[model samples]
Target: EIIPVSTTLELRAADESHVPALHQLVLKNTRKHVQGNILLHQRGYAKMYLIFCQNEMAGVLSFNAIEPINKAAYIGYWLDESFQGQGIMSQSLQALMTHYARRGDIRRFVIKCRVDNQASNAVARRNHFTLEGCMKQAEYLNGDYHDVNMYARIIDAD
Candidate 1:
């Protein structure tokens, strides 16, 4: 899905011109993820977007996996440390989907939050996503694997 311009935040499709900036916005594991994401995007199998807050590049968001045949997608996002809280991401998630849902392309949006993160859980709930299940030790972070809560939002997509 393409991004719409906003006064405080926006999403832009990642492209060759954004590679360097994307790298600068992330770190360690995510930097590597960015490189791979761009490759997947180029091949039309993935989606990555640069998050701009108030006209500044703040972080990245992407479909970690997109099952186009099933009209489902897994959404992942990382916001700049300085940009935490303040509803930026929750707003961005709604902004990104509400527009595309009308087109009826993707009907399911899946989001996984680290098991114990209060903020992340709030983000999911704020968007009215359901707690589907828990992914046991599904993500490796800070040198160890961690459980993630699987959340899903099924939409009318029409």
Candidate 2:
């Protein structure tokens, strides 16, 4: 017998009130690779979104390095361990991508994940991002260097 579970996911622009949840989720999921203090940094070049599932904080997503002149943006995301495998991130990402695509201002979206992070890589691929390249030792986390794989999606203006 197949049973269906009801879930509601929402994405909203992050604010100071979300700092605590965002901080905890990032530290728990990313192993401190990204600092919580980053939430307080300049947001003019980036936009952070908080993910809510059934009204509970589930993760964080951001559009970084938004270059209006270049019509490009970089995406980064992480979900709490308890929320993994629920398709939450995938659905949220698709929604965000669709919203950006329709805006006609952003033509390119880029995502980079560690080479060993299969889950994140899969998310990018499932969202129709193509493998652009691999950056050697692009990130240092937990005392070791890690290679990163870059993916991108290009939207054509009608």
Candidate 3:
């Protein structure tokens, strides 16, 4: 599925062949971390999508935690360094949320951003995701445990 973000940017379904490039696009960390995530996507545990800007790969966006029973989906995103400050992630997230918010099965969207991650936290807030709570010692990121900021938003068919 392809969701338009703007005239030159869009989110498209990612496949096996795109793995090489996908690895690089979302590799804000290690090869192991990036590689492991894509596997989860193949198992239907997480939904993956690639961002295309100006006909080139820009980054990756995902609903890494999709809980149908709870009518919720958790978001995870990583953008190429060069593509930052372009409003790519914010607008893409809004478009993706716009697409899925229309469905009856989903009502809540959550973003768990690292407490120190100013950019991601900003993205969530700018997308209208309210700061809900904090998950203490949430993720063992980079090296040590770090607290995560939780953001939540619900949408309607309208």
Which one wins on TM-score?
3
TM-score of 3: 0.84
TM-score winner between 1 and 3, please give it.
Answer: 3
Q: Write the per-residue lDDT of candidate 2 for residues 1-158, one digit (tens) a residue.
A: 11112358878677656667767766677323234324432433665677888888888777866887887888888788899887888888777777767766677889988999989899988888999999999989999999999999888655
User: Which candidate tops lDDT?
Assistant: 3
Off by over 4 Å in 1: 27-35, 42-44, 142-145
**Clash count in backbone of candidate 3:** 0
TM-score for candidate 1, please give it.
0.82
Better of 1 and 2 by TM-score: 1
Q: After superposition, how far is residue 74 of candidate 3 from its true place, in Å?
A: 0.7
Model 1 lDDT tens row, 88-138 = 888888877775577676778999889887888988999899999999999
Q: Between which residue pairs do clashes occur in model 2?
A: none
Off by over 4 Å in 3: 24-44
- Give the lDDT of residue 23 in candidate 3: 68
Write down the worst ten-residue block by lDDT for model 2: 31-40
Model 3 clashing residue pairs (backbone): none
